[PDB]
């Protein structure tokens, strides 16, 4: 059972390589995960210098296997059932009236540490849009992740809308399309329809002088 691997606080490593409209960059992140409370604490650093895009646009990319599933729903936890061999998570984020993000990450265990090596490719962005123009507010993100079973790929599919508030008080809609598939060839839990009530608190470290982000996320299953 992969559920026994999350019973306590688990070290989290996050390594990401991206290319948005030709701007290459890298993000590194560490933290702890406590599925018992769906509690996630992470800090990300831009290892190549300045981040070419708004941090908030990388939140959902930069470990849903750390979410708290109510006891009566634990038969729907695809994420933990695929561990420790892990699973492949692919997404396609569509920013309204702007470019799109196509990401492919691999979430798996490396010893006692949950790892998430991501590969992000961004194209079609407007040089002066809300993303490459850095006009999106850095504050709070909170939406529901609607999940559905994908018996064909023996995994799951999920979609949701992230509404990033712009500085002028407007909204930058970002449609997400998720596709998780198990790396290992073992039995994984195919869940009935349900969603992930997610909430992220972005903040800066008063002492960190490198482009970064301090995140305090909470993911809890519901819908059934």
44: containing domain: 1-224
Q: Give the residue among 149, 140, 135 at the shortest CA–CA distance from 191.
A: 149
- As beta bridge partners, residue 224 has none
Beta strand pairing status for 212-222 and 113-123?
Answer: unpaired
Q: Give the residue among 8, 164, 145, 23 at the shortest CA–CA distance from 89.
A: 145
Q: Give the residue among 50, 10, 14 at the shortest CA–CA distance from 29.
A: 14
d(CA 213, CA 143): 19
Question: What is the separation of C-alpha 109 from the centre of its chain, rounded to a whole number of angstroms?
Answer: 16
d(CA 222, CA 224): 6
d(CA 185, CA 188): 9
CATH number at residue 48: 2.40.155.10
* Contact indicator for 221, 195 with CB cutoff of 8 Å: yes
User: Which residues are within 8 A (CB) of 183 and not within 5 positions of it... i.e. 6 or more apart?
Assistant: 82, 85, 86, 87, 88, 106, 108
Q: Give the residue among 114, 116, 112, 115 at the shortest CA–CA distance from 103.
A: 116
**What is the CB neighbour count within 10 angstroms for residue 8?**
11
Q: DSSP H helical segments within the chain, as ranges?
A: 78-81
Counting the structural domains of the chain, the total is 1
Kindly write down the DSSP assignment for every residue of 152-199, as one continuous string: TTTEEEEEEEEEEEBTTS-EEEEEEEEEEEESS-S----PPSEEEEEE
Extended strands (E) in the chain:
9-20, 23-34, 39-46, 87-95, 100-110, 113-123, 140-150, 155-165, 171-182, 194-203, 212-222
Cα within 13 Å of Cα(47), Cβ side? 13
Resolution, expressed in angstroms to one decimal: 2.9
d(CA 147, CA 193): 6
């Amino acid at each position: 059972k992969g559920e026994e691997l999350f019973t306590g606080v688990v070290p989290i490593l996050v390594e990401l390589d991206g290319d948005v409209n030709g701007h290459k960059f890298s993000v590194s992140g560490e933290g702890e995960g406590d599925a018992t409370y769906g509690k996630l604490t992470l800090k990300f650093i831009c290892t190549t210098g300045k981040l070419p895009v708004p941090w908030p646009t990388l939140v959902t990319t930069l470990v849903q296997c750390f979410s708290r599933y109510p006891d009566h729903m634990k038969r729907h936890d695809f994420f933990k059932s695929a561990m420790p061999e892990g699973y492949v998570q692919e997404r396609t984020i569509f920013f309204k009236d702007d470019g799109n993000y196509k990401t492919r990450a691999e979430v798996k265990f490396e010893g006692d540490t949950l790892v998430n090596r991501i590969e992000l490719k961004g194209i079609d962005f407007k040089e002066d849009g809300n993303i490459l123009g850095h006009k999106l507010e850095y504050n709070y993100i909170s939406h529901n992740v609607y999940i559905t079973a994908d018996k064909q790929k023996n995994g799951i599919k999920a979609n949701f809308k992230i509404r990033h508030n712009i500085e002028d008080g407007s909204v930058q809609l970002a449609d997400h399309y998720q596709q998780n598939t198990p790396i290992g060839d073992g039995p994984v839990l195919l869940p009935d329809n349900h969603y992930l009530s997610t909430q992220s608190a972005l903040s800066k470290d008063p002492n960190e002088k490198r482009d970064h982000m301090v995140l305090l996320e909470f993911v809890t299953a519901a819908g059934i």
